[PDB]
Design a protein around this ligand. Structure first.
Ligand code: CA
Length: 207
């Protein structure tokens, strides 16, 4: 939503680490400083990797954010991201995010990264058919059936998982970069129809 009157940063953003992030972003002197909706509207990018952030509550007041770098934090719930319709790049590596339902309405999201999140079920990704790059390395994924719906992908990383069947990748003609090392792949027939592959990693398969 939005704030109708000047309000302290710490009152909008409960997480102290995230409040500090917003304070630096808006170039304020203290998280106790008051900010307006106009100022929150000016934010189109948040760079907060390894910032010890546990919650991004309050981010719902930043309608124009398009880039969100939140790698290496302590995130679990990303419900606050649900209505950030303009999100184009979302990096959430090294967190513990498993509920991907909050991404369903991010129809402009083009790049999504969720490596090292202990994820196994990615069926929620079906709602992101426009996705162009996807990084899901170092998780516990085995079933990638859903990926057949992401026909716009040109870059996909599924390295260090537990995948055996990659037939779902067969129809992803736009794939240029595919990372599948450290999995359980034996059958490579699914790669017969891929004409645009430039990068392909299949080493260290444990069958
Ligand atoms: Ca600072």
């Amino acid at each position: 939503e939005t704030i109708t009157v000047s309000t302290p940063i710490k009152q909008i953003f409960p997480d102290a680490a995230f409040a500090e992030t917003i304070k630096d972003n808006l170039k304020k002197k203290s998280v106790t400083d008051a900010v307006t909706q106009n100022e929150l509207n000016s934010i189109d990018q948040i760079i907060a990797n390894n910032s010890d952030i546990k919650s991004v509550q309050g981010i719902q007041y930043l309608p124009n954010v398009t880039k969100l770098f939140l790698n290496g934090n302590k995130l679990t719930d990303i419900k606050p991201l649900t209505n950030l319709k303009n999100l184009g790049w979302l990096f959430l590596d090294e967190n513990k995010i498993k509920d991907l339902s909050s991404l369903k309405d991010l129809k402009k999201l083009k790049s999504l990264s969720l490596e090292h999140n202990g994820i196994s079920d990615i069926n929620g990704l079906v709602h992101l058919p426009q996705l162009e790059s996807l990084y899901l390395g170092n998780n516990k994924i085995t079933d990638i059936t859903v990926l057949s719906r992401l026909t716009k992908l040109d870059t996909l990383s599924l390295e260090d998982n537990q995948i055996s069947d990659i037939v779902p990748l067969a129809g992803l003609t736009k794939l240029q970069n595919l990372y599948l090392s450290k999995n359980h792949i034996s059958d490579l027939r699914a790669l017969a129809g891929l004409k645009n592959l430039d990068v392909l990693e299949l080493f260290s398969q444990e069958c």
